[PDB]
PDB file of C-alpha atoms and ligand atoms in Angstrom:
ATOM      1  CA  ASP A  14    -108.428  58.305 121.763  1.00  0.00           C
ATOM      2  CA  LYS A  15    -106.038  60.045 119.384  1.00  0.00           C
ATOM      3  CA  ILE A  16    -105.211  62.668 122.017  1.00  0.00           C
ATOM      4  CA  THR A  17    -104.543  59.772 124.392  1.00  0.00           C
ATOM      5  CA  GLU A  18    -102.073  58.205 121.958  1.00  0.00           C
ATOM      6  CA  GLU A  19    -100.313  61.520 121.277  1.00  0.00           C
ATOM      7  CA  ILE A  20     -99.919  62.040 125.030  1.00  0.00           C
ATOM      8  CA  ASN A  21     -98.644  58.473 125.457  1.00  0.00           C
ATOM      9  CA  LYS A  22     -96.052  59.098 122.731  1.00  0.00           C
ATOM     10  CA  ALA A  23     -94.962  62.443 124.197  1.00  0.00           C
ATOM     11  CA  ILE A  24     -94.578  60.783 127.610  1.00  0.00           C
ATOM     12  CA  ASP A  25     -92.544  57.919 126.156  1.00  0.00           C
ATOM     13  CA  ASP A  26     -90.259  60.436 124.436  1.00  0.00           C
ATOM     14  CA  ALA A  27     -89.814  62.418 127.656  1.00  0.00           C
ATOM     15  CA  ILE A  28     -88.962  59.227 129.561  1.00  0.00           C
ATOM     16  CA  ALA A  29     -86.478  58.119 126.902  1.00  0.00           C
ATOM     17  CA  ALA A  30     -84.769  61.521 126.744  1.00  0.00           C
ATOM     18  CA  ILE A  31     -84.448  61.690 130.535  1.00  0.00           C
ATOM     19  CA  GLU A  32     -83.043  58.150 130.697  1.00  0.00           C
ATOM     20  CA  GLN A  33     -80.560  58.749 127.857  1.00  0.00           C
ATOM     21  CA  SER A  34     -79.137  61.494 130.087  1.00  0.00           C
ATOM     22  CA  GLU A  35     -76.848  60.996 133.063  1.00  0.00           C
ATOM     23  CA  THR A  36     -77.691  61.895 136.701  1.00  0.00           C
ATOM     24  CA  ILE A  37     -80.915  59.842 136.629  1.00  0.00           C
ATOM     25  CA  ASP A  38     -79.404  56.338 136.946  1.00  0.00           C
ATOM     26  CA  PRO A  39     -77.353  56.171 139.154  1.00  0.00           C
ATOM     27  CA  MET A  40     -78.908  59.208 140.897  1.00  0.00           C
ATOM     28  CA  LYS A  41     -77.035  60.904 143.724  1.00  0.00           C
ATOM     29  CA  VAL A  42     -79.058  61.767 146.827  1.00  0.00           C
ATOM     30  CA  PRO A  43     -77.596  64.390 149.199  1.00  0.00           C
ATOM     31  CA  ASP A  44     -76.263  63.152 152.525  1.00  0.00           C
ATOM     32  CA  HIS A  45     -78.804  63.129 155.338  1.00  0.00           C
ATOM     33  CA  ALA A  46     -78.507  63.056 159.122  1.00  0.00           C
ATOM     34  CA  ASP A  47     -81.166  62.695 161.787  1.00  0.00           C
ATOM     35  CA  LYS A  48     -81.779  62.105 165.454  1.00  0.00           C
ATOM     36  CA  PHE A  49     -84.381  59.520 166.346  1.00  0.00           C
ATOM     37  CA  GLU A  50     -86.277  57.870 169.169  1.00  0.00           C
ATOM     38  CA  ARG A  51     -88.281  54.647 169.123  1.00  0.00           C
ATOM     39  CA  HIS A  52     -89.760  52.307 171.737  1.00  0.00           C
ATOM     40  CA  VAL A  53     -89.300  48.569 171.147  1.00  0.00           C
ATOM     41  CA  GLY A  54     -91.102  46.835 173.989  1.00  0.00           C
ATOM     42  CA  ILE A  55     -89.383  47.906 177.200  1.00  0.00           C
ATOM     43  CA  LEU A  56     -86.385  49.270 175.279  1.00  0.00           C
ATOM     44  CA  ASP A  57     -86.226  53.022 174.641  1.00  0.00           C
ATOM     45  CA  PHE A  58     -83.893  53.725 171.710  1.00  0.00           C
ATOM     46  CA  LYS A  59     -82.520  57.268 171.412  1.00  0.00           C
ATOM     47  CA  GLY A  60     -79.732  57.900 168.955  1.00  0.00           C
ATOM     48  CA  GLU A  61     -78.496  59.461 165.755  1.00  0.00           C
ATOM     49  CA  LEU A  62     -77.732  58.347 162.209  1.00  0.00           C
ATOM     50  CA  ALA A  63     -76.099  59.654 159.044  1.00  0.00           C
ATOM     51  CA  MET A  64     -76.507  58.429 155.455  1.00  0.00           C
ATOM     52  CA  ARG A  65     -73.681  59.167 153.022  1.00  0.00           C
ATOM     53  CA  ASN A  66     -72.853  58.199 149.432  1.00  0.00           C
ATOM     54  CA  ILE A  67     -76.539  57.620 148.659  1.00  0.00           C
ATOM     55  CA  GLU A  68     -77.134  56.294 145.140  1.00  0.00           C
ATOM     56  CA  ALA A  69     -80.386  55.207 143.486  1.00  0.00           C
ATOM     57  CA  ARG A  70     -80.275  52.710 140.626  1.00  0.00           C
ATOM     58  CA  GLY A  71     -83.050  51.331 138.443  1.00  0.00           C
ATOM     59  CA  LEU A  72     -84.753  54.481 137.140  1.00  0.00           C
ATOM     60  CA  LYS A  73     -83.558  53.602 133.625  1.00  0.00           C
ATOM     61  CA  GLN A  74     -86.555  51.228 133.714  1.00  0.00           C
ATOM     62  CA  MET A  75     -89.152  53.989 134.094  1.00  0.00           C
ATOM     63  CA  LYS A  76     -92.191  53.074 132.027  1.00  0.00           C
ATOM     64  CA  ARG A  77     -95.611  54.592 131.445  1.00  0.00           C
ATOM     65  CA  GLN A  78     -98.272  52.524 133.238  1.00  0.00           C
ATOM     66  CA  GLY A  79    -101.361  52.302 131.053  1.00  0.00           C
ATOM     67  CA  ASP A  80    -102.897  54.997 128.908  1.00  0.00           C
ATOM     68  CA  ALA A  81    -102.849  58.625 129.916  1.00  0.00           C
ATOM     69  CA  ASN A  82    -106.138  59.331 131.672  1.00  0.00           C
ATOM     70  CA  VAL A  83    -107.513  62.108 129.455  1.00  0.00           C
ATOM     71  CA  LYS A  84    -110.528  64.353 130.080  1.00  0.00           C
ATOM     72  CA  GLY A  85    -111.550  67.507 128.234  1.00  0.00           C
ATOM     73  CA  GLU A  86    -113.129  70.511 129.966  1.00  0.00           C
ATOM     74  CA  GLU A  87    -113.811  73.970 128.484  1.00  0.00           C
ATOM     75  CA  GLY A  88    -111.637  73.353 125.448  1.00  0.00           C
ATOM     76  CA  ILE A  89    -108.657  72.329 127.590  1.00  0.00           C
ATOM     77  CA  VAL A  90    -107.468  68.724 127.599  1.00  0.00           C
ATOM     78  CA  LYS A  91    -106.269  67.553 131.007  1.00  0.00           C
ATOM     79  CA  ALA A  92    -104.333  64.326 131.449  1.00  0.00           C
ATOM     80  CA  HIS A  93    -103.007  62.433 134.447  1.00  0.00           C
ATOM     81  CA  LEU A  94    -100.372  59.726 134.085  1.00  0.00           C
ATOM     82  CA  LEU A  95     -98.531  57.146 136.150  1.00  0.00           C
ATOM     83  CA  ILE A  96     -94.913  56.207 135.407  1.00  0.00           C
ATOM     84  CA  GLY A  97     -93.198  53.456 137.304  1.00  0.00           C
ATOM     85  CA  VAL A  98     -90.791  50.571 137.765  1.00  0.00           C
ATOM     86  CA  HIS A  99     -93.095  47.772 138.875  1.00  0.00           C
ATOM     87  CA  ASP A 100     -91.561  44.614 137.374  1.00  0.00           C
ATOM     88  CA  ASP A 101     -88.050  45.654 138.466  1.00  0.00           C
ATOM     89  CA  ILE A 102     -86.828  47.315 141.666  1.00  0.00           C
ATOM     90  CA  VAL A 103     -85.292  50.703 142.448  1.00  0.00           C
ATOM     91  CA  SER A 104     -82.345  50.106 144.794  1.00  0.00           C
ATOM     92  CA  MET A 105     -80.759  52.685 147.106  1.00  0.00           C
ATOM     93  CA  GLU A 106     -77.275  51.996 148.407  1.00  0.00           C
ATOM     94  CA  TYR A 107     -75.572  54.056 151.065  1.00  0.00           C
ATOM     95  CA  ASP A 108     -73.187  54.096 153.986  1.00  0.00           C
ATOM     96  CA  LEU A 109     -74.960  54.334 157.340  1.00  0.00           C
ATOM     97  CA  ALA A 110     -73.269  55.504 160.526  1.00  0.00           C
ATOM     98  CA  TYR A 111     -75.361  55.274 163.677  1.00  0.00           C
ATOM     99  CA  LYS A 112     -74.861  55.996 167.369  1.00  0.00           C
ATOM    100  CA  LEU A 113     -76.864  54.186 170.066  1.00  0.00           C
ATOM    101  CA  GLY A 114     -75.345  54.108 173.544  1.00  0.00           C
ATOM    102  CA  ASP A 115     -71.751  52.912 173.185  1.00  0.00           C
ATOM    103  CA  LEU A 116     -72.336  51.657 169.613  1.00  0.00           C
ATOM    104  CA  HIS A 117     -70.993  53.834 166.788  1.00  0.00           C
ATOM    105  CA  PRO A 118     -70.485  51.583 163.741  1.00  0.00           C
ATOM    106  CA  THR A 119     -70.445  52.281 160.015  1.00  0.00           C
ATOM    107  CA  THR A 120     -72.107  49.726 157.749  1.00  0.00           C
ATOM    108  CA  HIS A 121     -73.352  49.480 154.172  1.00  0.00           C
ATOM    109  CA  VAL A 122     -77.074  49.398 153.405  1.00  0.00           C
ATOM    110  CA  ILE A 123     -79.079  48.251 150.386  1.00  0.00           C
ATOM    111  CA  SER A 124     -82.714  49.427 150.429  1.00  0.00           C
ATOM    112  CA  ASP A 125     -85.108  48.033 147.822  1.00  0.00           C
ATOM    113  CA  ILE A 126     -88.177  50.057 146.827  1.00  0.00           C
ATOM    114  CA  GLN A 127     -91.202  48.127 145.593  1.00  0.00           C
ATOM    115  CA  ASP A 128     -93.565  49.726 143.071  1.00  0.00           C
ATOM    116  CA  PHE A 129     -91.724  53.001 142.552  1.00  0.00           C
ATOM    117  CA  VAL A 130     -94.344  55.207 140.900  1.00  0.00           C
ATOM    118  CA  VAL A 131     -94.536  58.847 139.794  1.00  0.00           C
ATOM    119  CA  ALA A 132     -97.843  60.668 139.307  1.00  0.00           C
ATOM    120  CA  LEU A 133     -97.876  63.443 136.713  1.00  0.00           C
ATOM    121  CA  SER A 134    -100.457  65.895 135.356  1.00  0.00           C
ATOM    122  CA  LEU A 135    -100.573  67.789 132.052  1.00  0.00           C
ATOM    123  CA  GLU A 136    -102.754  70.454 130.474  1.00  0.00           C
ATOM    124  CA  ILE A 137    -103.050  70.997 126.710  1.00  0.00           C
ATOM    125  CA  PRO A 138    -104.849  74.163 125.490  1.00  0.00           C
ATOM    126  CA  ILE A 143     -98.439  71.124 126.844  1.00  0.00           C
ATOM    127  CA  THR A 144     -97.883  72.423 130.384  1.00  0.00           C
ATOM    128  CA  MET A 145     -96.980  70.151 133.304  1.00  0.00           C
ATOM    129  CA  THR A 146     -99.154  71.023 136.310  1.00  0.00           C
ATOM    130  CA  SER A 147     -98.264  68.330 138.876  1.00  0.00           C
ATOM    131  CA  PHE A 148     -95.401  65.904 139.528  1.00  0.00           C
ATOM    132  CA  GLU A 149     -94.831  63.697 142.569  1.00  0.00           C
ATOM    133  CA  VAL A 150     -93.135  60.468 143.566  1.00  0.00           C
ATOM    134  CA  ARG A 151     -95.865  58.559 145.356  1.00  0.00           C
ATOM    135  CA  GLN A 152     -95.305  57.146 148.825  1.00  0.00           C
ATOM    136  CA  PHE A 153     -93.362  53.905 148.612  1.00  0.00           C
ATOM    137  CA  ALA A 154     -95.530  50.808 148.973  1.00  0.00           C
ATOM    138  CA  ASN A 155     -92.668  49.006 150.704  1.00  0.00           C
ATOM    139  CA  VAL A 156     -88.986  49.558 151.500  1.00  0.00           C
ATOM    140  CA  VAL A 157     -86.915  46.450 152.259  1.00  0.00           C
ATOM    141  CA  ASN A 158     -83.764  47.406 154.164  1.00  0.00           C
ATOM    142  CA  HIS A 159     -80.615  45.269 154.321  1.00  0.00           C
ATOM    143  CA  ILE A 160     -78.188  46.650 156.909  1.00  0.00           C
ATOM    144  CA  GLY A 161     -74.800  44.930 156.792  1.00  0.00           C
ATOM    145  CA  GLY A 162     -74.025  42.925 159.911  1.00  0.00           C
ATOM    146  CA  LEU A 163     -77.473  43.227 161.528  1.00  0.00           C
ATOM    147  CA  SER A 164     -79.885  40.336 161.976  1.00  0.00           C
ATOM    148  CA  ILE A 165     -83.525  40.869 161.068  1.00  0.00           C
ATOM    149  CA  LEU A 166     -84.255  39.701 164.638  1.00  0.00           C
ATOM    150  CA  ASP A 167     -82.083  42.429 166.172  1.00  0.00           C
ATOM    151  CA  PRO A 168     -84.138  45.199 167.855  1.00  0.00           C
ATOM    152  CA  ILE A 169     -81.492  47.625 166.620  1.00  0.00           C
ATOM    153  CA  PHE A 170     -82.377  46.466 163.109  1.00  0.00           C
ATOM    154  CA  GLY A 171     -86.047  47.069 163.871  1.00  0.00           C
ATOM    155  CA  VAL A 172     -85.407  50.633 165.012  1.00  0.00           C
ATOM    156  CA  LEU A 173     -82.960  51.446 162.215  1.00  0.00           C
ATOM    157  CA  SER A 174     -85.195  49.971 159.506  1.00  0.00           C
ATOM    158  CA  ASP A 175     -88.207  51.913 160.796  1.00  0.00           C
ATOM    159  CA  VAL A 176     -86.301  55.212 160.933  1.00  0.00           C
ATOM    160  CA  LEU A 177     -84.848  54.552 157.470  1.00  0.00           C
ATOM    161  CA  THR A 178     -88.274  53.779 155.997  1.00  0.00           C
ATOM    162  CA  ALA A 179     -89.583  57.062 157.423  1.00  0.00           C
ATOM    163  CA  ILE A 180     -86.556  58.885 155.982  1.00  0.00           C
ATOM    164  CA  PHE A 181     -87.262  57.357 152.568  1.00  0.00           C
ATOM    165  CA  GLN A 182     -90.926  58.376 152.673  1.00  0.00           C
ATOM    166  CA  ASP A 183     -89.821  61.924 153.576  1.00  0.00           C
ATOM    167  CA  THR A 184     -86.338  63.079 152.555  1.00  0.00           C
ATOM    168  CA  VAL A 185     -85.520  60.587 149.796  1.00  0.00           C
ATOM    169  CA  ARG A 186     -88.849  61.063 148.049  1.00  0.00           C
ATOM    170  CA  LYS A 187     -88.440  64.849 148.229  1.00  0.00           C
ATOM    171  CA  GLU A 188     -84.925  64.695 146.753  1.00  0.00           C
ATOM    172  CA  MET A 189     -86.018  62.404 143.918  1.00  0.00           C
ATOM    173  CA  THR A 190     -88.912  64.758 143.200  1.00  0.00           C
ATOM    174  CA  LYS A 191     -86.437  67.665 143.144  1.00  0.00           C
ATOM    175  CA  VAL A 192     -84.384  65.892 140.496  1.00  0.00           C
ATOM    176  CA  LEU A 193     -87.161  64.390 138.372  1.00  0.00           C
ATOM    177  CA  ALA A 194     -89.766  67.183 138.232  1.00  0.00           C
ATOM    178  CA  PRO A 195     -87.679  69.775 136.302  1.00  0.00           C
ATOM    179  CA  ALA A 196     -86.361  67.116 133.903  1.00  0.00           C
ATOM    180  CA  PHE A 197     -89.897  66.067 132.967  1.00  0.00           C
ATOM    181  CA  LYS A 198     -90.998  69.714 132.894  1.00  0.00           C
ATOM    182  CA  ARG A 199     -88.230  70.557 130.428  1.00  0.00           C
ATOM    183  CA  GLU A 200     -88.912  67.548 128.212  1.00  0.00           C
ATOM    184  CA  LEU A 201     -92.714  67.804 128.117  1.00  0.00           C
ATOM    185  CA  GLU A 202     -93.053  71.584 127.818  1.00  0.00           C
ATOM    186  CA  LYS A 203     -90.667  71.781 124.843  1.00  0.00           C
TER     187      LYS A 203
ATOM    188  CA  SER B   9     -84.802  16.197 166.051  1.00  0.00           C
ATOM    189  CA  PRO B  10     -81.566  17.148 164.269  1.00  0.00           C
ATOM    190  CA  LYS B  11     -83.247  19.676 161.948  1.00  0.00           C
ATOM    191  CA  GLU B  12     -85.092  21.390 164.805  1.00  0.00           C
ATOM    192  CA  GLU B  13     -81.861  21.128 166.794  1.00  0.00           C
ATOM    193  CA  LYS B  14     -79.799  22.925 164.152  1.00  0.00           C
ATOM    194  CA  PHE B  15     -82.459  25.633 163.921  1.00  0.00           C
ATOM    195  CA  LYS B  16     -82.502  26.135 167.698  1.00  0.00           C
ATOM    196  CA  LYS B  17     -78.688  26.167 167.824  1.00  0.00           C
ATOM    197  CA  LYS B  18     -78.385  28.869 165.155  1.00  0.00           C
ATOM    198  CA  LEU B  19     -81.225  30.816 166.794  1.00  0.00           C
ATOM    199  CA  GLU B  20     -79.514  30.726 170.193  1.00  0.00           C
ATOM    200  CA  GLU B  21     -76.290  31.986 168.609  1.00  0.00           C
ATOM    201  CA  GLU B  22     -78.153  34.851 166.918  1.00  0.00           C
ATOM    202  CA  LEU B  23     -79.781  35.678 170.261  1.00  0.00           C
ATOM    203  CA  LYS B  24     -76.390  35.663 171.988  1.00  0.00           C
ATOM    204  CA  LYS B  25     -74.988  38.178 169.510  1.00  0.00           C
ATOM    205  CA  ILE B  26     -78.133  40.317 169.891  1.00  0.00           C
ATOM    206  CA  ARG B  27     -77.775  40.220 173.691  1.00  0.00           C
ATOM    207  CA  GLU B  28     -74.133  41.280 173.473  1.00  0.00           C
ATOM    208  CA  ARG B  29     -74.983  44.225 171.220  1.00  0.00           C
ATOM    209  CA  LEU B  30     -77.881  45.318 173.449  1.00  0.00           C
ATOM    210  CA  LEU B  31     -75.584  45.295 176.492  1.00  0.00           C
ATOM    211  CA  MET B  32     -73.765  48.184 174.752  1.00  0.00           C
ATOM    212  CA  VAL B  33     -76.897  50.377 174.881  1.00  0.00           C
ATOM    213  CA  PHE B  34     -78.944  49.367 177.939  1.00  0.00           C
ATOM    214  CA  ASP B  35     -78.409  48.231 181.505  1.00  0.00           C
ATOM    215  CA  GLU B  36     -77.961  44.531 182.222  1.00  0.00           C
ATOM    216  CA  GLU B  37     -81.377  43.932 183.784  1.00  0.00           C
ATOM    217  CA  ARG B  38     -83.354  45.705 181.045  1.00  0.00           C
ATOM    218  CA  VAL B  39     -81.563  43.580 178.439  1.00  0.00           C
ATOM    219  CA  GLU B  40     -82.332  40.437 180.435  1.00  0.00           C
ATOM    220  CA  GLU B  41     -86.046  41.255 180.686  1.00  0.00           C
ATOM    221  CA  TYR B  42     -86.164  42.035 176.960  1.00  0.00           C
ATOM    222  CA  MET B  43     -84.439  38.768 176.018  1.00  0.00           C
ATOM    223  CA  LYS B  44     -86.884  36.878 178.250  1.00  0.00           C
ATOM    224  CA  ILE B  45     -89.922  38.451 176.558  1.00  0.00           C
ATOM    225  CA  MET B  46     -88.393  37.755 173.127  1.00  0.00           C
ATOM    226  CA  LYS B  47     -87.810  34.076 173.944  1.00  0.00           C
ATOM    227  CA  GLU B  48     -91.396  33.819 175.200  1.00  0.00           C
ATOM    228  CA  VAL B  49     -92.694  35.134 171.864  1.00  0.00           C
ATOM    229  CA  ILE B  50     -90.386  32.785 169.930  1.00  0.00           C
ATOM    230  CA  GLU B  51     -91.692  29.836 171.958  1.00  0.00           C
ATOM    231  CA  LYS B  52     -95.335  30.722 171.311  1.00  0.00           C
ATOM    232  CA  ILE B  53     -94.749  31.143 167.559  1.00  0.00           C
ATOM    233  CA  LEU B  54     -92.850  27.855 167.237  1.00  0.00           C
ATOM    234  CA  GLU B  55     -95.450  25.975 169.292  1.00  0.00           C
ATOM    235  CA  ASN B  56     -98.333  27.371 167.238  1.00  0.00           C
ATOM    236  CA  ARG B  57     -96.637  26.338 164.001  1.00  0.00           C
ATOM    237  CA  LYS B  58     -95.917  22.841 165.371  1.00  0.00           C
ATOM    238  CA  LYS B  64    -103.685  33.425 167.019  1.00  0.00           C
ATOM    239  CA  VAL B  65    -100.476  34.288 168.884  1.00  0.00           C
ATOM    240  CA  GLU B  66    -100.435  36.980 171.550  1.00  0.00           C
ATOM    241  CA  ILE B  67     -97.834  39.624 170.698  1.00  0.00           C
ATOM    242  CA  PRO B  68     -96.588  42.124 173.306  1.00  0.00           C
ATOM    243  CA  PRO B  69     -96.792  45.784 172.266  1.00  0.00           C
ATOM    244  CA  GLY B  70     -93.776  47.073 170.375  1.00  0.00           C
ATOM    245  CA  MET B  71     -92.876  43.527 169.263  1.00  0.00           C
ATOM    246  CA  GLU B  72     -95.155  43.223 166.204  1.00  0.00           C
ATOM    247  CA  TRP B  73     -92.133  44.009 164.030  1.00  0.00           C
ATOM    248  CA  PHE B  74     -90.355  41.080 165.666  1.00  0.00           C
ATOM    249  CA  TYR B  75     -93.266  38.730 165.019  1.00  0.00           C
ATOM    250  CA  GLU B  76     -93.238  39.552 161.309  1.00  0.00           C
ATOM    251  CA  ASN B  77     -89.428  39.395 161.115  1.00  0.00           C
ATOM    252  CA  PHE B  78     -89.306  36.057 162.951  1.00  0.00           C
ATOM    253  CA  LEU B  79     -91.880  34.578 160.592  1.00  0.00           C
ATOM    254  CA  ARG B  80     -89.663  35.690 157.704  1.00  0.00           C
ATOM    255  CA  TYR B  81     -86.533  34.334 159.438  1.00  0.00           C
ATOM    256  CA  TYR B  82     -88.062  30.943 160.255  1.00  0.00           C
ATOM    257  CA  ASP B  83     -89.542  30.484 156.783  1.00  0.00           C
ATOM    258  CA  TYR B  84     -86.143  31.374 155.303  1.00  0.00           C
ATOM    259  CA  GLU B  85     -84.200  28.943 157.507  1.00  0.00           C
ATOM    260  CA  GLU B  86     -86.778  26.167 157.045  1.00  0.00           C
ATOM    261  CA  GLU B  87     -86.676  26.480 153.256  1.00  0.00           C
ATOM    262  CA  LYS B  88     -82.881  26.418 153.566  1.00  0.00           C
ATOM    263  CA  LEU B  89     -82.866  23.299 155.777  1.00  0.00           C
TER     264      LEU B  89
HETATM  265 NA1  LIG C 301     -75.040  61.128 149.432  1.00  0.00          NA
END
């Protein structure tokens, strides 16, 4: 109960220190390119895309979700925590160039992430033992100039959602994990 | 029905732009078959609103069209 409150306070301090620092909001994401294939009905889409100038905003709203889940075994306190941005949204903006057949346009994209959540684990004999950005519950993609009824939108939005669940989540983990490690293990 | 008419007019214009863009990726006949299947699904959805069979690979379109129609109807 007291250990739970101390861990809550330490987590809140880590969050505040990371947010008071730059690089977290807006957060740069390295450029990413990919080939892709999808099948939409009878249409067989094969093409390539590139995402540049990728920026994530909204992580200044990171907030501990509920008490630290604390359990003590063999004189070591273990705690798992969730930190998220559930009331607000984390938005990714980027320039998208894609090639499909004779189409090679560049457009601007806004991708909204719902329920951005980080799972974290601590051990107190504080050492951080686990840190991950959980899979996104939903990614809403707005691709400039494309109708939501366009099959090209369907393909591009599906490929982009997969890229967010893979590359983007890995890059955000790369940035966030050492920041939290530094703040908590001090 | 002027409201239904404005919806169908805007929808046909969106479909025309989609058809033009698809003709830059696929052959003419494939695009025509795809547009025909799409219009069939649109018809079924609109008639049901006035369980819908959905061809494989078009489930995304069914969800997106529900979102599009609800958006335009709340706008109208
Ligand atoms: Na970038």
